[PDB]
Amino acid sequence: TAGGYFRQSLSYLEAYNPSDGTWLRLADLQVPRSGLAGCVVGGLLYAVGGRNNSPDGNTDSSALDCYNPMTNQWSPCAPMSVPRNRIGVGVIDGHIYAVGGSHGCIHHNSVERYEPERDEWHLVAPMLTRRIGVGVAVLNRLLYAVGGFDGTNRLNSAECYYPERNEWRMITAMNTIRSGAGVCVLHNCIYAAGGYDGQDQLNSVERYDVATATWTFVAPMKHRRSALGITVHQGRIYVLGGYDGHTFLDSVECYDPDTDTWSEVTRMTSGRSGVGVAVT
Ligand SMILES: O=C(O)CCc1ccc(O)cc1
């Protein structure tokens, strides 16, 4: 987990061990950020976009920054073409897709691709929808923009990116309006967890099966949370932090699919929301 928000933007980089339950402190971000996404290419942990909320400013980020796990050092990579706060990212065969996000009052539908060994960015097909707080996930080498906020409406729609065809295709919408949901793939179906619908923070969770183009609910999380971090470790889903309408959780819940149950597995070292997350 990289970055996050609690009273201001965070530089924290911490790792959770689901075996012994403890948390490992690691090298701070060069620049604090909330509303960023995390991802892994070549075993390297990347932190994309976001925003530095502090008592001195609120600047959206175009930064891309790389952390080496054996080296514990951050390096500047090329910036995106535009700042993207509340971004979604997905990895397709070692490439970085930066999706949506905001810059001030501007709500991006644009998408951009980064080449890790070549350190370059280029724009591609824009989404059909302007999406802030978009969940992004890759399933069967296909990219999914899920949920989010267009500036007026929070979204239950979802659209799919075809790399080779470089086109966006709307798909079946979710049952539930979700902005700032945690979105990932677990088993072989896209999971969208929690989020915010313009009125409430959500605990419901729903999964999309490609072969039936259908969304189905599963067990809700224990705690309603938007701006949660999401990733998949040892065949299970992990939700981290987020906001519930009253407090910034350190609560971490773990979904068991076999039973279809969630359980709180740890507390973060400090309550927070809006982190970037990836796994090694
Ligand atoms: O729709 C929202 O306004 C944008 C995304 C967003 C959702 C929840 C949250 O706590 C922070 C950000």
Swiss-Prot record:
Top-level taxon in the UniProt lineage: Eukaryota
- Note the segments forming the Kelch repeats: 1-43, 44-94, 95-141, 142-188, 189-235, 236-280
Instruction: Write down the position(s) of the site called Sensor for electrophilic agents.
Output: 105
The effect annotated for residue 5 to A is: Loss of interaction with NFE2L2/NRF2. Strongly reduces repression of NFE2L2/NRF2-dependent gene expression. Loss of interaction with PGAM5
Quote the annotated effect of residue 196 to A: Loss of interaction with NFE2L2/NRF2. Strongly reduces repression of NFE2L2/NRF2-dependent gene expression. Abolishes interaction with SQSTM1/p62
**Outcome of mutating residue 21 to S:** In a NSCLC cell line
Location(s) in or outside the cell: Cytoplasm; Nucleus
In which tissues is this gene expressed? Broadly expressed, with highest levels in skeletal muscle.
Variant or mutagenesis effect after changing residue 101 to C: In a lung adenocarcinoma patient; somatic mutation; strongly reduces interaction with NFE2L2/NRF2 and reduces repression of NFE2L2/NRF2-dependent gene expression
- Residues that the record marks as modified (S-cGMP-cysteine) are 105
Q: What is known of its domains?
A: KEAP1 contains reactive cysteine residues that act as sensors for endogenously produced and exogenously encountered small molecules, which react with sulfhydryl groups and modify the cysteine sensors, leading to impair ability of the BCR(KEAP1) complex to ubiquitinate target proteins.
User: Family assignment?
Assistant: Belongs to the KEAP1 family.
Known role: Substrate-specific adapter of a BCR (BTB-CUL3-RBX1) E3 ubiquitin ligase complex that regulates the response to oxidative stress by targeting NFE2L2/NRF2 for ubiquitination. KEAP1 acts as a key sensor of oxidative and electrophilic stress: in normal conditions, the BCR(KEAP1) complex mediates ubiquitination and degradation of NFE2L2/NRF2, a transcription factor regulating expression of many cytoprotective genes.
User: Can you say what this protein is called?
Assistant: Kelch-like ECH-associated protein 1
**Species this protein is from:** Homo sapiens
Q: Which gene is annotated as encoding this protein in its UniProt record? A: KEAP1
What part of the full protein is here?
A: 330 to 609 of 624
